[PDB]
Structure 1
Amino acid sequence: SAVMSATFAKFHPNLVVGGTYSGQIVLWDNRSNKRTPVQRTPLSAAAHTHPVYCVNVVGTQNAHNLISISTDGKICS
């Protein structure tokens, strides 16, 4: 999917994540034998409807909260 604002992952440099245009967020892992995202988000009601413009990390590895801001007026930490 068209990933928008694929930011880092605190204490996971190689486990890069990214919000998409579809409304889902994708988590890649270069060291998981798949450059394609290993942790994809389904496009159900739990995720976002409108495009996810800003996925971003909040807190260290203890509280690895990944807020994925979308254009729906709905975000997902």
Structure 2
Amino acid sequence: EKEICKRSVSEISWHPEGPTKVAVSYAIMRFQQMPEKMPTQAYVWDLLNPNSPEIKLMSPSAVTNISYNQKIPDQIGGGCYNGLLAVWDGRKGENPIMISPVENSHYEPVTHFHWLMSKTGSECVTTSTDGKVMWWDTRKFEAGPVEKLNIIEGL
């Protein structure tokens, strides 16, 4: 409602327990067409009151891909247009609790972000148009990601 230009629904994710809430991201994938200081923020809808969003996810830069984590009920994780990774909490929302370092985190935007369910405390994986896949640790954002693979073709 009343945003500076329109914002494309860049990615959607469902709530793991059941179809009660739907977390959705908002960013422009057209290059440099995004306005200067456009509203960078993901929302989360409830199927009972679809008038306006139930809770707001304020981010540093526009969120490209988000998903829910089935392991930790209501812990949404998202990949920004900057290259930054962010993680919120679906109950309290507001500002992001875990944010990656600017320098070590990949250049160009996160094209996909998915949770590694098969782990005690959850981990998350992340690809980009830079062509560098990364296996991040959610507990420990620390000094950059754990694994760095550049996507060579042919050998």
User: What runs of 5+ residues in structure 1 fail to find an aligned partner?
Assistant: none
Give the one of 55, 76, 82 matched to 1:22.
82
TM-superposed deviation, 1:58 = 2.0
1:57 equivalent in structure 2: 115
Q: CA RMSD in A?
A: 1.9
Counterpart in 2 of 1:70? 128
Q: Which has the higher strand share?
A: 1
Instruction: Please give the alpha-carbon distance, in whole angstroms, between the structure 2 residues aligned to 1:19 and 1:70.
Output: 10
1:4 positional shift? 1.1
Aligned position for 1:8: 68
- CA deviations 1:35-75 (Å, max 9, x no partner) are 21111112112x11111111111233426331011221112
Distance in 2, matches of 1:66 and 1:4, equals 15
Q: 1:19 and 1:74 mapped to 2: Cα distance?
A: 14
Q: In structure 2, how many angstroms separate the alpha carbons of the residues matched to 1:63 and 1:29?
A: 15
Report the equivalent of 1:41: 100
What are structure 2's unaligned runs of at least 5 residues? 1-60, 136-155
Identify which of structures 1 and 2 has the higher relative contact order when contacts are C-alpha pairs closer than 8 Å and 6+ apart: 1
Conservation of the 8 A alpha-carbon contact between 2:71 and 2:117: no
Structure 1 pair 11–59 and aligned structure 2 pair: CA distance change class (3 A): closer
Residues 57, 34 of structure 1: alpha-carbon distance in 2 compared, 3 angstrom cutoff: closer
* Larger CA Rg, structure 1 vs 2: 2
Task: Decide whether aligned partners of structure 1 residues 71 and 13 sit closer, same or farther in structure 2, where only a CA change above 3 A counts.
Answer: farther
